[PDB]
Structure 1
């Protein structure tokens, strides 16, 4: 089997991407944030504290003839951005782009943190990291991909995120029309439950490539590119007037600037992030200070190849017995 679904930016900045997901019978379609940095499929629901729901579409398990309470199971998750959610668990039929999993754990939120409430466009998350990170207790549950994998034509999914435009998540096949040149594959460590890999270096604009190993995670659920402070300083030094602002929470730059590109290495291959991808616009409405899309990972504890990086590539998440990651230009 295969599946193919379009993923759509939630706003003009590509702060996140939503993908429609069918849950239950008859289908209830929710727009979920596909997150290769976590491993829970959770949704706003009829059980979510009413004051914490503000415009989201909810899953109502009592209206699904295939929903079953997973007795005794609870979940609770905290994300790197400080947000969180928790609740109980149903199993139900879940379909993405024509690919159907029966008996998928659908984690129903009883509580969500304010950032989730305040984002009316995201109805929940669909985790695509390794199932070892799944938070369901006392019986850990499998991700949608893990459940689907054996049925797929090939045990892979691909992320093809757009810049200020829709893109595609495919399951079970590699669309050879969706990228240019070849796909370069690179080793993955699953030790921390992430799609963790090592970039071979970077360049800023038309500058020389610096060969240096940068361990980090491919994370579709993180907006920005978080890299070591040395790398990030080298980038922003090429933008007149850019500075790290403790009050804003990262590098800012004059909105009048033209940003240089940023290149990262994948083996001997190179992925170029155009400068415009690194612009996250005014820090507040009407400001001439703009927020940068490359930020320091210092104090996160891990480097994160988030959407800023991934949207410059066609990315293969290869879930073979020994997982790997592939990157192509597009």
Structure 2
């Protein structure tokens, strides 16, 4: 089997991407955040504290004839941005882009933190990291991909995120028309539960490539590119007037600037992030200070190749017995 679904930016900045997901019978379609840095499929629901729902579409398990309460199971997750959610668990039928999993754990939120409430466009998360990170207790549950992968034509999914435009998540096949050149594959460590890999270096604009190992994860659920402070300083030094602002929380730059590209290495291959992809717009409405899309990882403990990086590539998440990542230009 295969599946293919369009993923759409939630706003004009590509702050996140939402993908429609069918849950239950009859289907209830929710727009989820496909997240390769976590492993829980959770949704706003009829069980979510009413004051914490503000415009999201909810899953109502009592209206799904295939929903079954997973007796005694609870979940609770906290993310690297400080957000969180928790609740109970159903199993139900879940379909993405025509690919169907029966008995998928659907984690129903009883509580969500304010950032989730305040974002009416994200109805929940669909985790695509390794199932070792799933938070369901006392019986850990499998991700949608883990449940589907034996049925897939090939045990892979691909992320093709758009810049200020829709893109595609495919399951079970590699669309050879969706990229240019070749896909370069690189080793993955699953020891922390992420799609963790080692970039071979970077360049800023037209500058020389610096060969240096940068261990990080491929995270569709992280918006920006988080790299070591040395690398980030080297980038922003090429933008006149850019500076790290403790009050704002990262590097900012004059909105009048033209940003240079940023290149990262995948083996001997090179992925070029155009400068425009690094502009996250005014820090507050009407400001001429703009927020940068490349930020230091020093305070996170791990480098993150988030959407800023991934959207410059066609990315293969190869879930073979020994997982690997693939990157192609597009």
Distance 1:67 1:41 in 2: 15
Distance 1:107 1:79 in 2: 16
Could you report, residue by residue, the CA deviation over 1:146-175 in whole angstroms, capped at 9, with x for unpaired residues? 000000000000000000000000000000
Local SS of the residue matching 1:137: coil
Long gaps (5+) in structure 1: none
Q: What is the Cα deviation at residue 31 of structure 1?
A: 0.1
Could you report, residue by residue, the CA deviation over 1:65-94 in whole angstroms, capped at 9, with x for unpaired residues? 000000000000000010000000000000
Aligned pairs for 1:26-65 (under 5 A) are 26-65=26-65
Structure 1 residue aligned with 2:140: 140
Distance 1:14 1:299 in 2: 23
Local SS of the residue matching 1:109: strand
- Over the aligned positions, Cα root-mean-square deviation in angstroms equals 0.1
Local SS of the residue matching 1:69: strand
Distance 2:254 2:45 in 1: 42
Distance 2:301 2:41 in 1: 24
Aligned residues: 330
Could you report, residue by residue, the CA deviation over 1:162-190 in whole angstroms, capped at 9, with x for unpaired residues? 00000000000000000000000000000
Q: What is the Cα deviation at residue 24 of structure 1?
A: 0.1
Q: What is the Cα deviation at residue 62 of structure 1?
A: 0.1
Could you report, residue by residue, the CA deviation over 1:128-163 in whole angstroms, capped at 9, with x for unpaired residues? 000000000000000000000000000000000000
Distance 1:241 1:192 in 2: 38
Q: What is the Cα deviation at residue 299 of structure 1?
A: 1.2
Local SS of the residue matching 1:185: strand
Could you report, residue by residue, the CA deviation over 1:238-296 in whole angstroms, capped at 9, with x for unpaired residues? 00000000000000000000000000000000000000000000000000000000000
Distance 1:172 1:292 in 2: 35
Distance 1:177 1:282 in 2: 36
Distance 1:93 1:289 in 2: 46
Distance 1:15 1:173 in 2: 27
Local SS of the residue matching 1:151: coil
Local SS of the residue matching 2:29: strand
Could you report, residue by residue, the CA deviation over 1:26-67 in whole angstroms, capped at 9, with x for unpaired residues? 000000000000000000000000000000000000000000
Structure 2 residue aligned with 1:311: 311
Distance 1:86 1:161 in 2: 28
Distance 1:82 1:24 in 2: 30
Distance 1:242 1:61 in 2: 49
Local SS of the residue matching 2:234: helix
Q: What is the Cα deviation at residue 237 of structure 1?
A: 0.1
Distance 1:201 1:244 in 2: 23
Segments of 4+ moved more than 3 angstroms: none
Could you report, residue by residue, the CA deviation over 1:88-130 in whole angstroms, capped at 9, with x for unpaired residues? 0000000000000000000000000000000000000000000
Asked whether 1:297 is paired with 2:311, we answer no
Distance 1:274 1:189 in 2: 28
Distance 1:217 1:268 in 2: 18
